[PDB]
Structure formats: structure tokens, C-alpha cells
Amino acid sequence: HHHHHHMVHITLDRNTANSWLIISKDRRQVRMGDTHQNVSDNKERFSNYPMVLGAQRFSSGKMYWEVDVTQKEAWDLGVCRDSVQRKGQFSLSPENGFWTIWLWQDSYEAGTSPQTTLHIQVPPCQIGIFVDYEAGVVSFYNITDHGSLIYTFSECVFAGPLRPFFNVGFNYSGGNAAPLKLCPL
Ligand SMILES: CCC(=O)N1CCC[C@@H](NS(C)(=O)=O)C1
């Protein structure tokens, strides 16, 4: 792909984070803490899952960023509407305002309803995410495998401003403590 020139500098929004997340001082890394991280509750925080949004809102144009997923066993990445549900249980689907992929139990899947199996020969250590607002496209790239395409959502109905979306995943196994990191430009 030749999307790298639409690179945007993403930072995480502490106020949206699940109360167990630890966001680095530079707002570029997030990991799940061992306990509640001593913050007040608010209506923005994801309650049920270890999720957080980027601070940036996109309503036009082309945007690209990269995320490091090294040594994680589970995670979700992509974009979502600014108006997505924060409290209770929900599925990641375009009907609920999410355009995402994930790793779970040694398989990669796109967050369609129902979910779509992905075909990845080289497990990625860094993921590129491209959004074309006007075209209604969200695409995912395998930076470890020379930028190969992972998945394209097309005919997207965003229906609002978009925010970068992250889920560090649970850590019941002891094998998923590693952070998500926003990679430098
Ligand atoms: C997402 C935060 C939360 O509700 N919890 C409670 C359930 C298990 C906890 N910890 S764990 C096993 O290390 O993932 C995290």
C-alpha cells in the first residue's frame, strides 16, 4: 500500500478508558493494570471491556496510523462512531458502530456480523489502519509482512464522527499483559 503519507499522530483519551487501564504519560501506550487504577467513574468509560478511544475525531479525508501488538494473545483494533454504547455488553459490528479486526484464541477475525475468518500467514507484530471517510472504507495492513492487506470494510455507513478504537483484551491466561503501542511516523 501507499497510504503512509496520510499518517496522523493518534493519542489516547484517558477519560474514555476502562478504569483498569494504564495509559502512558505520552498517551501513546495502553495496558491492563492488575486492579482498578484509582480514577472516578464517568459516562464515557467502557465498563465491561478493556477498551479506550483515541482523542482525535475524523469526519472527512484520509487517515493512517500503526499499532504494535507484539506478544499479545488477544486484542481488538479499528475505528468506531463517537456515539457507540459504553456500558454493558455489546458485539463489535458495523450495525453497532464499529469497524474492527481482532485476535482471539489463535485466530484473526473481522468484526462483521457474523464475524469473518481472516487468512494471515505471518502473525503481525504491527497493524496499519487506513480510513477513507468519503469513500466509506476501513482497511487493515500487516506491517510485519511488507504491508500486505488483511481486510477491507467497504460500503461503510459511518453515520457520525469516527474515533480510533482499541481493546487490550483480558489477561485471564497471564500471557496477555503486554501493551498496545501507537508506533512513530
Ligand atoms: C476489564 C476489567 C475488568 O472488568 N476485570 C474484571 C474481570 C477480570 C479482571 N482482570 S484480568 C483476568 O486480568 O483480565 C478485569
Curated annotation (Swiss-Prot):
Gene symbol of the encoding locus: Trim21
B30.2/SPRY domain span: 8-185
Comment text on domains: The coiled-coil is necessary for the cytoplasmic localization.
Source species taxonomy: Eukaryota, Metazoa, Chordata, Craniata, Vertebrata
Compartments, as annotated in UniProt: Cytoplasm; Cytoplasmic vesicle, Autophagosome; Nucleus; Cytoplasm, P-body
Protein name: E3 ubiquitin-protein ligase TRIM21
Subunit note: Homotrimer. Component of a SCF(SKP2)-like complex containing CUL1, SKP1, TRIM21 and SKP2. Interacts with CALR, CUL1, FBXW11, HSPA5, IKBKB, IRF3, SKP1 and VCP. Interacts with SKP2; the interaction with SKP2 does not depend on an intact F-box domain. Interacts (via N-terminus and C-terminus) with DCP2 (via N-terminus and C-terminus). Interacts (via C-terminus) with IRF8 (via C-terminus). Interacts with ULK1, BECN1 and with ATG8 family members, including GABARAP, GABARAPL1, GABARAPL2 and MAP1LC3C/LC3C. Interacts with TRIM21 and SQSTM1/sequestosome 1. Interacts with IRF3.
Post-translational modification: Autoubiquitinated; does not lead to its proteasomal degradation. Deubiquitinated by USP4; leading to its stabilization. Autoubiquitinated.
Induction entry: Up-regulated by IFN.
Family membership noted in the UniProt record: Belongs to the TRIM/RBCC family.
Biological source species: Mus musculus (Mouse)
Record function comment: E3 ubiquitin-protein ligase whose activity is dependent on E2 enzymes, UBE2D1, UBE2D2, UBE2E1 and UBE2E2. Forms a ubiquitin ligase complex in cooperation with the E2 UBE2D2 that is used not only for the ubiquitination of USP4 and IKBKB but also for its self-ubiquitination. Component of cullin-RING-based SCF (SKP1-CUL1-F-box protein) E3 ubiquitin-protein ligase complexes such as SCF(SKP2)-like complexes. A TRIM21-containing SCF(SKP2)-like complex is shown to mediate ubiquitination of CDKN1B ('Thr-187' phosphorylated-form), thereby promoting its degradation by the proteasome.
